[PDB]
Amino acid sequence: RPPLDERSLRDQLIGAGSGWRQLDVVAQTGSTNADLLARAASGADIDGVVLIAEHQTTARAQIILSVGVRVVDVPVQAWGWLSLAAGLAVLDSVAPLIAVPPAETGLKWPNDVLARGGKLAGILAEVAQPFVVLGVGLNVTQATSLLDLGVAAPDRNRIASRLLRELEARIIQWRNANPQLAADYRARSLTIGSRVRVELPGGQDVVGIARDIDDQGRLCLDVGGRTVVVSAGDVVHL
Fold it and tell me: How far apart are CA 98 and CA 77, in angstroms?
């Protein structure tokens, strides 16, 4: 598997009106999210900073990265939309490469990108006020993978540039409260309109039809005409 070309990525992604300020690829680390968080704790401005790892403790079989996002300027109740924005960015980046009908892939609320029912990518947001660290893990040649979906020799450098472009685009929409973000999300949602079970602490299930995602990124269920909104956590598609 060819390596990521850090210099090419910088040349492409860093520039006057670009959102990205810094980009680094490391051979190995434990967790890119932990590293950006620890950079934040030590006083660095991590807004628009990108950290990509070839392997987190098979190397080069994924794209694994974290980006920093300053959130303190955005109402706190909107911060839940960042993980959603990131999933959409990921899907949009890879949907054109895969040999499966658009129908058929999409976003499983809150944190997963699916394709033919298998997990293609996952998003993890973690907060470090005034920042959020957004982590992305995309399955390239590893659940499913680009390879398993028909991409015979995925170009990880091109895919990384696409992903980061899309991520910046959606982060801008999010910062600007652009209603197009949520519209584009719902259009690619596998959860909305589906019957779902939410398994709650204490062996309490709630079963209903997912009707919407609210302005805080929460899942709105219809339970026999009553609305139940659930905070971020796993949900089971029925």
Answer: 35
Whether residue 97 contacts residue 167, with contact meaning beta carbons closer than 8 Å, is answered with no
Query: Which pairs from 229-233 meet CB under 8 Å and 24+ separation?
Result: 230/198, 230/206, 232/80, 232/83, 232/110, 232/111, 233/110, 233/198
Spatial distance between the Cα atoms of 65 and 54, rounded to a whole number of angstroms: 9
| Cα–Cα distance, 207 to 119 (Å, whole number) | 23
132 contact partners, CB below 8 Å, separation of at least 6: 68, 69, 71, 79, 82, 125, 126
- Can you list the domains of the chain with their CATH numbers? 1-191 (3.30.930.10), 192-238 (2.30.30.100)
- DSSP-derived letter for residue 149 is G
d(CA 62, CA 21): 23
d(CA 34, CA 196): 32
Torsion angle, CA of 58/235/188/93, rounded to 10 degrees?
-20
Q: How was this one solved?
A: X-ray
Q: Is 198 helix (H, G, I), strand (E, B) or coil?
A: strand
Q: What distance lies between CA 113 and its chain's CA centroid?
A: 8
